[PDB]
């Protein structure tokens, strides 16, 4: 009868099954991963928010997200993240 408190648990588990099919995860670890996801989400959205503000634009497009990722993620992490992101967006434009 409680209140719906959403999470990222099932998605971290799906990714976990794709990367390590025979590996499990404890409750506390899933909580930590969930906090990490909300953290990175807020950072990226925050930087995109200010980026939109500075240039007096009212829309967050792929450009702002990309530039925000380049600002927040160090080196190769950022590079591969842009590779995966751009690839995905390209694929998404087809479907």
């Amino acid at each position: 009868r409680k209140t719906r408190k959403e999470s990222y648990a099932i998605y971290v588990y799906k990714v976990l099954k794709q990367v390590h099919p025979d590996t499990g995860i404890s409750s506390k670890a899933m909580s930590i991963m969930n906090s990490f996801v909300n953290d990175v989400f807020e950072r990226i959205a925050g930087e995109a928010s200010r980026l939109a503000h500075y240039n007096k634009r009212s829309t967050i497009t792929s450009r702002e997200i990309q530039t925000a990722v380049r600002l927040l993620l160090p080196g190769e992490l950022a590079k591969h993240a842009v590779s995966e992101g751009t690839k995905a967006v390209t694929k998404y434009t087809s479907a």
């Binding site: 909580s31 906090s35 990490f36």
Partner: peptide, 17 residues
Amino acid sequence: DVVYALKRQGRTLYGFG
């Protein structure tokens, strides 16, 4: 409240929401 407090001082804590 404690988590947000920790966030407020740039000492973010993972694992409680």
